[PDB]
Amino acid sequence: GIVEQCCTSICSLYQLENYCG
């Protein structure tokens, strides 16, 4: 999920936009 990709590892704009509506 988002925590494993953006909190326990370094986030990216691509990853964040995966969760927009």
Added chain:
Amino acid sequence: FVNQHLCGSHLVEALYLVCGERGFFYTPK
């Protein structure tokens, strides 16, 4: 500001800024 470790409320704040009017879903699991 998004290429760092973002945890807790900081991650949710990042989604808010990036997604804007599109909204977002936050699922820490």
